[PDB]
Design an enzyme around this catalytic site. Sequence first.
Site, PDB file in Angstrom:
ATOM      1  N   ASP A   7       0.766  -1.323   0.023  1.00 39.83           N
ATOM      2  CA  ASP A   7       0.036   0.026   0.113  1.00 39.83           C
ATOM      3  C   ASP A   7       1.034   1.213   0.061  1.00 39.83           C
ATOM      4  OD1 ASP A   7      -0.788   1.434   3.363  1.00 39.83           O
ATOM      5  OD2 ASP A   7      -0.838   2.619   1.216  1.00 39.83           O
ATOM      6  N   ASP A 105      -3.676   3.038  -5.171  1.00 41.89           N
ATOM      7  CA  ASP A 105      -2.681   3.107  -4.204  1.00 41.89           C
ATOM      8  C   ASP A 105      -2.470   1.424  -3.697  1.00 41.89           C
ATOM      9  OD1 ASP A 105      -4.793   2.756  -2.210  1.00 41.89           O
ATOM     10  OD2 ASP A 105      -3.339   3.469  -0.652  1.00 41.89           O
ATOM     11  N   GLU A 106      -3.051   0.721  -4.218  1.00 42.74           N
ATOM     12  CA  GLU A 106      -2.834  -1.004  -3.548  1.00 42.74           C
ATOM     13  C   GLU A 106      -2.646  -2.233  -4.612  1.00 42.74           C
ATOM     14  OE1 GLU A 106      -6.445   0.061  -1.749  1.00 42.74           O
ATOM     15  OE2 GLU A 106      -5.367   1.536  -0.421  1.00 42.74           O
TER      16      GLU A 106
END
Length: 341
Positions: A7, A105-106
């Site tokens: 992350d 973002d992941e």
Amino acid sequence: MIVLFVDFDYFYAQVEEVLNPSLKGKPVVVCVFSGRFEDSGAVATANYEARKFGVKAGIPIVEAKKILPNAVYLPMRKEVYQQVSSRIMNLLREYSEKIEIASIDEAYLDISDKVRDYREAYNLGLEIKNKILEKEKITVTVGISKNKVFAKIAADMAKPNGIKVIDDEEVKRLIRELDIADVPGIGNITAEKLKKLGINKLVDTLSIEFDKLKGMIGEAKARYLISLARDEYNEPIRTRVRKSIGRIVTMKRNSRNLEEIKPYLFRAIEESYYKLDKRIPKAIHVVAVTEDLDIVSRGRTFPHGISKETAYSESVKLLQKILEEDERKIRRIGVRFSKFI
DNA sequence: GGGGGAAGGATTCC
DNA sequence: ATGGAATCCTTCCCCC
Ligand SMILES: [Mg+2]
Ligand SMILES: [Mg+2]
């Protein structure tokens, strides 16, 4: 099989602290400003210098400007972070062939035929976590264990700048022990719906009837919450692909007039339609958000792809239809695009 | 009874 | 007060 997830610490707050480092150290708040009133809008990401004093994604910009009035207030530069994010997507794939990009973002990885063990896990995890930074000035949190979900928890309770390890002994040990509102996919609402079902953890999903679970959450979550109280789950790094592309805006006034709603609407389309580039949507949807703050959309599918003209056309059609089966006052109005060729 | 979808609301995340 | 892009999940209808 074994999954490592990574992350991106408060992505947005940070990209901007790579673009202007005079920002680092201090409070920083990327937000989305409306037009309604001077500084009208919602926070979108904040770093810990902000989150730590109460400022978080969600809250009105004005009740932030209340808590930390001398914070740096920045408009949302999305595109700018999608690209950066992708630069890092390809550096990630510089390790793995079957990468799963869960969101901007992941993303998850099968370090499987690459690493067998939590020695050589914490090792290479960290491996990537200094390279993302060195080659990019950007910091993450990596986490380790047997499945998707279980890695996210590893990350969630060590982020930011962190590296989590989690023994397939503690995959269990969690179940029995862990709060259940903290389950990827479990929000406020389901968490809520869940202590009324008696459930406070995972293991506690094996007590309670299942057809009672059904109408409380749906078999959906049901089986899902269930498989994890087993140590199994075991679900593999799919590819995944944007399904819908939308853009929703907010009008200087709640309104019910079409010549008043069209320009905003028509803007959503342009914006959505440029973000499409190279994809043909087989279905549209207009989504108005009631005056009284509820969503009411109205989709439509077709046996082909939609030309902007069609998009322009059906759109008014979806929109009136909505001014029918309803009659409050539409504040925000927008559009998604789905079933791409 | 259910396969195969499309339409619509609801819920999750940041 | 309450941005927003996105998915998830329930119900509906058509017809075998
Ligand atoms: Mg993040
Ligand atoms: Mg949650």
